[PDB]
């Protein structure tokens, strides 16, 4: 809208109320659209026996397809946007403007891989709220998208050559952050909920659970195959809720032709860490908290009292 001159604003992408508001709106956007046949949430408020709230309702099959959502300034506030082509979300931004609303965000719910998002204008960028903390998500933004083609018949395809090149660029950026004398290793998820251990996402209204081991099984800068990567997948009916602690059950698929091709534009990872005189770092696919997903798009925005 209007660029600000001489104005230098201070940003902190890890404490940004836009992320929370959007997280709530996307949650409510899911309830009125994708209703579960059964929904289970804990309730142990009382100091004794636990209780499960159970809701049962009509659960129409819906061929879900996210329309881009814009975050617009609420009454009494304004949106400041950092224009730096490579901004890490923290510190002062010298090139800043004011905007009506954000760019259009796709409210995709997924783990491990960020789909149909924004690419880094220049080089691959990696972000974290605390790189020293091995427990904090590391958000990766690619500058070149990588296609992932999935079918309800039980698999996702990814071009191997493209993925390998992408990994080489991630590893470069990682040792730029953790030490140029370090070997970078990618490994499969170490464990936890299925939604988190597999590349998990929803496609054509269905929840896919894809084994991503083949994507994360390589060593880089250590010493010195098949055309495509085919990840085996599973559509499931009993899902762990991402909106809060609980479980949902949906009905089996009614389509024999579930298909959706996405672009991988980013990754969510965690670093192993731990006291080790070993000059190498291990990285595994992560995610689960969709706020990381929203942060991957909203890092350059900030809401301010007018």
């Amino acid at each position: 809208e209007v660029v600000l001159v001489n104005v230098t604003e201070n940003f902190n992408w890890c404490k940004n109320d836009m992320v929370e508001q959007m997280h709530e709106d996307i949650i409510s956007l899911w309830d009125q659209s994708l209703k579960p046949c059964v929904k289970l949430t804990p309730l142990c408020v009382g100091a004794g026996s636990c209780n499960t709230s159970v809701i049962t309702q009509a659960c129409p099959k819906v061929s879900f397809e996210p329309i881009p959502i814009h975050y617009c300034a609420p009454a009494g506030f304004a949106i400041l946007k950092c224009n730096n082509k490579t901004f890490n979300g923290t510190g002062p931004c010298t090139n800043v403007s004011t905007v009506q609303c954000t760019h259009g965000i796709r409210p995709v719910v997924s783990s491990q891989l960020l789909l149909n998002g924004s690419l880094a204008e220049e080089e691959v960028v990696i972000r974290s709220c605390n790189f020293t903390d091995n427990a904090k998500t590391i958000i990766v933004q690619l500058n070149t998208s990588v296609e992932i083609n999935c079918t309800g018949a039980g698999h996702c395809n990814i071009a191997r050559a493209k993925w390998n090149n992408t990994l080489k660029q991630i590893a470069s950026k990682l040792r730029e952050q953790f030490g140029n004398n370090k070997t970078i290793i990618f490994k499969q998820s170490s464990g936890g909920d299925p939604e988190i251990v597999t590349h998990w996402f929803n496609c054509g209204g269905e929840f896919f659970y894809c084994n991503s081991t083949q994507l994360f099984n390589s060593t880089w800068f250590n010493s010195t195959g098949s055309d495509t990567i085919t990840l085996p997948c599973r559509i499931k009916q009993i899902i762990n809720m991402w909106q809060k602690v609980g479980k949902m059950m949906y009905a089996p698929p009614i389509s024999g032709q579930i298909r959706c091709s996405s672009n991988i534009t980013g990754l969510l990872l965690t670093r192993d860490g731990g006291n080790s005189n070993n000059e190498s770092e291990i990285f595994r696919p992560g995610g689960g908290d969709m706020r990381d997903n929203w942060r991957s798009e909203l890092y350059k925005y900030k809401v301010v009292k007018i």
Partner: antibody, heavy 128, light 110 residues
Framework: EVQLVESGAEVKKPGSSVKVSCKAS????????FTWVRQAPGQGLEWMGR????????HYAPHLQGRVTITADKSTSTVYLELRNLRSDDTAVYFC?????????????????????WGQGTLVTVSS | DIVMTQSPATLSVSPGERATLSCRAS??????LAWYQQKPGQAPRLLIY???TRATGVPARFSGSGSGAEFTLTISSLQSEDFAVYYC???????????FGQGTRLEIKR
């Protein structure tokens, strides 16, 4: 293939409660859903309710809502039917029945409404 | 509430001949329809599910057809062990409120 064995015949006064059981053996318990169906002498079959064992969630027929409870004990592979405030017209043979729902422990669930496996039945007589 | 209605109440068939059993619904139940066989003193036995899929152990002379609000059970050649009571069951609705027809008694015509 699961084998369903139900508990013995029951005789109750009107106004009492009854709790009949059903031991499922032969297969993986939490991969089945279990349904209770009853049949009054000389009458047809009547669906009473069904439990999604893996989730521990049961749904009941409207004319029964409020006085029927279906439970499942996973440590013993046993399904239970409780019918409260018994009436003389509750006299019937009560059948335990079940069907395989898929690899439920991996989140696959067909929610089948049909009934492949059946117990031998339990006669419940309600009379003064 | 979905009311299932079977006809006729009693079907009399000479041995070795074909029997046709009817089942109707008060509203569409798509293909969530099953057929059971029951002999005096015994539990019901699943024959057909999904309107037309035979259960394991069910011989080929049993076939189900139809969808929506009208269904048929056909037995192409009645054997001695086929004479029994036959029930249909609808399981289309959610929340589940599944219901049975009142049965067709198939007896030996002499």
């Amino acid at each position: 293939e699961v084998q369903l064995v139900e508990s013995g015949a029951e005789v109750k006064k009107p106004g009492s409660s009854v709790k009949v059981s059903c031991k499922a053996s032969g297969d993986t318990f939490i991969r089945y859903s279990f349904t209770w169906v009853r049949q009054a002498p000389g009458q047809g079959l009547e669906w009473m309710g069904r439990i999604i064992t893996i989730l521990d969630v049961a749904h009941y027929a409207p004319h029964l809502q409020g006085r029927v409870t279906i439970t499942a004990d996973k440590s013993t592979s046993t399904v239970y039917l409780e019918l409260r405030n018994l009436r003389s017209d509750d006299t019937a043979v009560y059948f335990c029945a079940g069907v395989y729902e898929g690899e439920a422990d991996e989140g696959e669930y067909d929610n089948n409404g049909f009934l492949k496996h059946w117990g031998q039945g339990t006669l419940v007589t309600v009379s003064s | 509430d979905i009311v299932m209605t079977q006809s006729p109440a009693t079907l009399s068939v000479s041995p070795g001949e074909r029997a046709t059993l009817s089942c109707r619904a008060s509203e569409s139940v798509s293909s969530d329809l099953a057929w059971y066989q029951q002999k005096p003193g015994q539990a019901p036995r699943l024959l057909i599910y999904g309107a037309s899929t035979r259960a394991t152990g069910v011989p080929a002379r049993f076939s189900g057809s139809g969808s929506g609000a009208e269904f048929t059970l056909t037995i192409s050649s009645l054997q001695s062990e086929d004479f029994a009571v036959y029930y249909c069951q609808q399981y289309n609705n959610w929340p589940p409120r599944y219901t049975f027809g009142q049965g067709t008694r198939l007896e030996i015509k002499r």
